[PDB]
């Protein structure tokens, strides 16, 4: 099983630089072109350039040469992208792709992407609000439940409900930013059959800031 | 120039149609083999982008047969073939060869009939009063088409300041849309008035779907 396995989240300040990683595993390493890629939204996917692990042979967009450094180390398996001189043009999810030959020619095996942040904003956790319905006749057959989450920074957040158990009806909305501060949020419907005679909880991680919180959803009054 | 240009930007279509997608380069692109290195990827939200054609006409394992590619010298097509409601995203064109350029990208969107929003509203938590702020929530989920207006009522009074809205990206088993709308006011502002109301209105009617409570539960 081919895998490309990315760093996690960066949030850096305007200026500076940043190094993630690309860890390969399930084929010969140093017999591909490795290549990254950038999504910043609003521009689409932008080819930033490749490097030959076997001996580190680089190849870079006219765009970003002086502004990305590709390495890699072969007894780690590893390959890695530096960015200098950040600004907040480079926010985006950064992407790391393997380039097949044989049984295929281009790009066929991706990493999950690092994102990251540039900004002198101070890193906040996520305040998360549990929603209740506010009266019980605003409940009927089904129920529609829900966790805010505010003040956050940098993004992102992820959220599931009942450890995952619970995926069927639910709406996880894309973040707003407001003056520094992250704000989404995410519904769920379920029986009223289920709640609140079953326990619900919404799980919300910020690995941005090392940090988890996990809501039960309890009726008011 | 070799520039790779889509056409065109945003491809509604409605389920069952043929799709089809344009990408040219400002140059001819064969390789010196013969050969022309030109893929389709496709990215959906939430996920990394993922190889569906490799020079210009091969299927990549797992891609269904209703995606076929063709073209030749600065002419290239990807041709959906009876689309269905998980195909919707954004499709890149993608020149492999000497400096590797993508293509500006096709957002794929599903037309279907109008759908009305089930609406759902919150009060703020014990917990967010406790610090000294008050966000009234309102959910308006599964409608179509996408485009909705929320309207927030304090007391039967219209209020348009300090709302955050948010939209889901089309589903991909219903094509319909969701939104959220967050009033966010000092625990203070709240507690001066007792009826909160959340009204959308959508084509689905002349009448707005409202949806409220009272502090007084």
């Known amino acids: 099983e081919v895998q490309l396995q990315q760093s996690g989240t960066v949030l850096a300040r305007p200026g500076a630089s940043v190094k993630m990683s690309c860890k390969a595993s399930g084929y010969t390493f140093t017999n591909y072109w490795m290549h990254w890629i950038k999504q910043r939204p609003g521009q689409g996917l932008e080819w930033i350039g490749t490097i030959y692990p076997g001996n580190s042979d680089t190849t870079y967009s006219q765009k970003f040469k002086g502004k990305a450094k590709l390495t890699a180390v072969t007894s780690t398996s590893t390959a890695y992208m530096e960015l200098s001189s950040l600004t907040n043009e480079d926010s985006a999810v950064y992407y790391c792709?393997?380039?097949?030959?044989?049984?295929?020619?281009?790009?066929?095996?991706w990493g999950q992407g690092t994102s990251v942040t540039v900004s002198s904003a101070k890193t906040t956790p996520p305040s998360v609000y549990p929603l209740a319905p506010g009266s019980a006749a605003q409940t009927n057959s089904m129920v529609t439940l829900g966790c805010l989450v505010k003040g956050y920074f940098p993004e992102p957040v992820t959220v599931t409900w009942n450890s995952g158990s619970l995926s069927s009806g639910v709406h996880t909305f894309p973040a707003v930013l407001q003056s520094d501060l992250y704000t989404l949020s995410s519904s769920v419907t379920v029986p009223s059959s289920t709640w609140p005679s079953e326990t619900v909880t919404c799980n919300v991680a910020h690995p941005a800031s090392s940090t988890k919180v996990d809501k039960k959803i309890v009726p008011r009054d | 120039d070799v520039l790779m240009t889509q056409t065109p930007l945003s491809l509604p279509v409605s389920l069952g149609d043929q799709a089809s997608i344009s990408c040219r380069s400002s140059?001819?692109?064969?390789?010196?083999?013969?050969?022309?290195?030109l893929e389709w990827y496709l990215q959906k939200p939430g996920q990394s982008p993922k190889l569906l054609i490799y020079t210009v006409s091969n299927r990549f394992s797992g891609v269904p047969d209703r995606f076929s590619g063709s073209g030749s010298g600065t002419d290239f097509t990807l041709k959906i073939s009876r689309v269905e409601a998980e195909d919707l995203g954004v499709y890149y064109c993608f020149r492999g060869s000497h400096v590797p350029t993508f293509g500006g990208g096709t957002k794929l969107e599903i037309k279907r009939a109008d759908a009305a929003p089930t609406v759902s509203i919150f009060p703020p938590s014990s917990e967010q009063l406790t610090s000294g702020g008050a966000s009234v929530v309102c959910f308006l989920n599964n409608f179509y088409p996408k485009d909705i207006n929320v309207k927030w009522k304090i007391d039967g009074s219209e209020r348009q300041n300090g709302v955050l809205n948010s939209w889901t990206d089309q589903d991909s088993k219903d094509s319909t849309y969701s939104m959220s709308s967050t009033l966010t006011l000092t625990k203070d502002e709240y507690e001066r008035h007792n009826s909160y109301t959340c009204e959308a209105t959508h084509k689905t009617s002349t009448s707005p779907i409202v949806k409220s409570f009272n502090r007084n539960e």
């Open positions: 792709s393997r380039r097949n030959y044989g049984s295929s020619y281009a790009m066929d095996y």
């Open positions: 140059q001819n692109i064969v390789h010196s083999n013969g050969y022309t290195y």
